[PDB]
Amino acid sequence: MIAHLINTDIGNRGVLKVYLDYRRKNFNFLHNSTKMFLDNLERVLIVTGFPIPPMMVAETDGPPGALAIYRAVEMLGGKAEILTYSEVEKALEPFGVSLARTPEPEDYSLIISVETPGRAADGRYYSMSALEIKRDPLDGIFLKARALGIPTIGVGDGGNEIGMGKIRELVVGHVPHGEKIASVVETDELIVSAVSNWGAYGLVAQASIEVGRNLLEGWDERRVIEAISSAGLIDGVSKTLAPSVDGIRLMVHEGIVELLKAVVDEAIL
Amino acid sequence: NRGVLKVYLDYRRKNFNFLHNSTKMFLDNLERVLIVTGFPIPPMMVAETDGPPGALAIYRAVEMLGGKAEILTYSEVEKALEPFGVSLARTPEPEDYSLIISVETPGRAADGRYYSMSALEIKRDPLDGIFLKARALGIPTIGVGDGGNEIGMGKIRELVVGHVPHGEKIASVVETDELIVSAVSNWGAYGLVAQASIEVGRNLLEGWDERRVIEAISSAGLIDGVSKTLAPSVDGIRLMVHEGIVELLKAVVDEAIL
Lengths: 269, 258
Ligand SMILES: [Mn+2]
Ligand SMILES: [Mn+2]
Ligand SMILES: [Mn+2]
Ligand SMILES: [Mn+2]
Ligand SMILES: [Mn+2]
Known about the structure:
The structure is a homodimer.
Chain A: H1 2-5, H2 13-25, H3 29-39, E1 43-48, E2 51-52, E3 57-58, H4 63-76, E4 79-83, H5 86-91, E5 110-114, H6 140-148, E6 152-156, H7 168-174, H8 178-181, E7 189-192, H9 196-211, H10 221-230, H11 250-268
Parallel strand pairs in A: 1-4, 1-5, 5-6, 6-7
Antiparallel strand pairs in A: 2-3
Helix pairs in contact in A: 3-9, 4-9, 9-11
One manganese (II) ion (MN) binds at residues 115, 156-158, 161, 196 of chain A.
PDB class: unknown function
Keywords: Mn2+-dependent phosphatase, unknown function
Assembly: dimeric
């Protein structure tokens, strides 16, 4: 099953414990996020981009997930655009992605965050290692969306990203520096995953099953990771230009993807 | 299904390190390991494809690590595993082994009988008797199940009743020192080998060919637990998913070991 797979145990105790508790009360969270996804495809805004102190450069986790969702929205008949930092706009350039300009929540039917910084309790922005983030914020549009009642979906794997506000108690208690770094920003639905890109892929995968088409077909993890890495995006852990995500090498990410595609094909047949 | 996942969720929340702890025990008693497997599917009472593959995977890992292994199982399964030249247990006594493992084997319920997950009574010579003796003797024991009616589940009987249909009647009362719960039993066994690989620094799963093992045992007469037919699948799920599971585990091990 998809929610369980994208939360595969990868040696990160914090995220696993959060997932366990989160799913105890919200067993169908991925299903609900999907239902909200499918119902508002008209015009989707995807937000991604996570600055890595002390360089404050964006990492490899997030954009791939955004591209996958972007891809799925277009294939489903909707329209999508991406709000993110410049280094990320450059990395996604080859993929012919509609970039968002002067966006206001009103203009969208659904807004999704894939690994984006969420302001903490003190109104500041922190990394998982408690270092403060200094880069113009992107969560602002989610607050306006919540106030307007516009559908929102968050995807995260740490506790300091947009959407984590819906389960801050789980973050404070299961993650180091939690109380200080846990984002306060909420979304209508939330997807927790071992790696954010997988959360994004899981959404795409669950949607694939409900529409009867494998929306992941054609996706090439290695090609995408290597492109955005050659383009300047760093690995979150090594903080270097290695073609990897969250310090984990490509065969693992590639394996997740390929397994999701199989799980989807098997479910549609 | 929804049951197993809910039972896994609770168990993992309660025992965060159950797989790691199972692996420690495994790695510590490899001198002579007895692996038990074989689950009859009512009404035909023939063994299914879930279990034998996992048992075979452990058997192999035990030998690659220098220990010795033997298999206690039903006749059709012995036949099904004949091509792999696995040592078959004869008149097995508890005392003779340093470790006893079960991969998808029926455990007696509270009323002393055996039931499938659909509450049908299993009628065939039992294999759990040695686990009862093993724990009374103090012999290390590990169980791998994915339903709640398998050997080792007696350890979490409460979790089984609160999430599995027919629970009270079918939940196995048979305990085991360490217990592995997984969506499919075979994957529990591979997880064990993957975890052992990480602890040892060697990919013990390298070379594992899910396709061959399942088509082989299927050709030999082992039916699919869900469809109850001779399809090359396990738990009603086609091979491309199991190949994917295995491939994913092989990469995770590489990630840790390199
Ligand atoms: Mn994160
Ligand atoms: Mn990440
Ligand atoms: Mn690494
Ligand atoms: Mn079972
Ligand atoms: Mn099974």
